Design a protein around this ligand. Structure first.
Ligand SMILES: COc1ccc(Cl)cc1-c1nn(C)cc1NC(=O)c1cnn2cccnc12
Length: 280
């Protein structure tokens, strides 16, 4: 079985990244024992979260798209084995490559994120975690959606999935329905995409991050009152400002991701056409 990675041959090299419950490591699968084996990215949990990882593995095993990270297999306790992309995420790549990545490349990356996301939605799934940290860089010409840790299936003939465990949520990327009722629609991922586009256009600058910008708008002195204050700001019609050097035509497309009601938001296909017209 080419998708079965034996524990004895999966050699840990170094850490790539870490979250609250999981971590990704660079390993080499070396059955020959001479360091000629293929490098792979391995996701595992820190010592039920085990059940969630098993559902995440089965989602990725069945996704096939040029802008979705490639599933390679499993190591059985279970580890998810995937292709290794040495450039890492946009969050680490963009601050180090501003000279190479111009506006034309930023908009092509935006089209690619939209294509991967439209494919996920056609498979009846809602991501719930679309942010620059979850987009990997294949090359200066290609990006891939690189994590599916919070992904849920939407029931047939239903418009949304309700999440009970909303602990450690990326609130500054969440649409009003997610914050107010814990409801996740395909239109909620469109809202998240608008915030990821803002990150891409600022080259993931820490000082102008969505969290930093919203906290200036609401006040960084609230604590447990932060989310209510965020909801009030959005209900008032306030939104993230236009990124520096971002043309108005691009900002207007970003604004279409942030219509208050999910049913009024632009689709991923409408965004692709919008960006393709600006690229011509
Ligand atoms: C999407 O990334 C993550 C997802 C979950 C976690 Cl827990 C950490 C990262 C992460 N943090 N950082 C800083 C870098 C990461 N990842 C890579 O560099 C990487 C390279 N190839 N690859 C393939 C699949 C997944 N990740 C990678």
């Amino acid at each position: 079985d080419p998708t079965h990675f034996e524990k004895r041959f999966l050699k840990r090299i170094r850490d790539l990244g870490e979250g609250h419950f999981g971590k990704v490591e660079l390993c080499r699968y070396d059955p020959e024992g001479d360091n000629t084996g293929e490098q792979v990215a391995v996701k595992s949990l820190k010592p039920n979260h085990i059940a969630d990882l098993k559902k995440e593995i089965e989602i990725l095993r069945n996704l096939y798209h040029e802008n979705i990270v490639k599933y390679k297999g499993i190591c059985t306790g279970i580890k998810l084995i995937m292709e290794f992309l040495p450039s890492g995420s946009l969050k680490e790549y963009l601050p180090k490559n501003k000279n190479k990545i111009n506006l034309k490349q930023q908009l092509k990356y935006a089209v690619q994120i939209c294509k991967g996301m439209d494919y996920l939605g056609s498979r009846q799934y809602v991501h719930r975690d679309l942010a620059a940290r979850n987009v990997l860089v294949e090359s200066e010409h290609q990006v891939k959606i690189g994590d599916f840790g919070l992904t849920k299936a939407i029931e047939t003939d239903k418009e949304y999935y309700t999440v009970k465990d909303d602990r450690d949520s990326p609130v500054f990327w969440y649409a009003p329905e997610c914050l107010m009722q814990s409801k996740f629609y395909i239109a909620s991922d469109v809202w998240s995409f608008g915030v990821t586009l803002h990150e891409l256009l600022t080259y993931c600058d820490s000082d102008s991050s969505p969290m930093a910008l919203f906290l200036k708008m609401i006040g960084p002195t609230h604590g447990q009152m932060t989310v209510t204050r965020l909801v009030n700001t959005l209900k008032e019609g306030k939104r993230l400002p236009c990124p520096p050097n971002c043309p108005d035509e691009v900002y207007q497309l970003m604004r279409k991701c942030w219509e208050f009601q999910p049913s009024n938001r632009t689709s991923f296909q409408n965004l692709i056409e919008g960006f393709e017209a600006l690229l011509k």
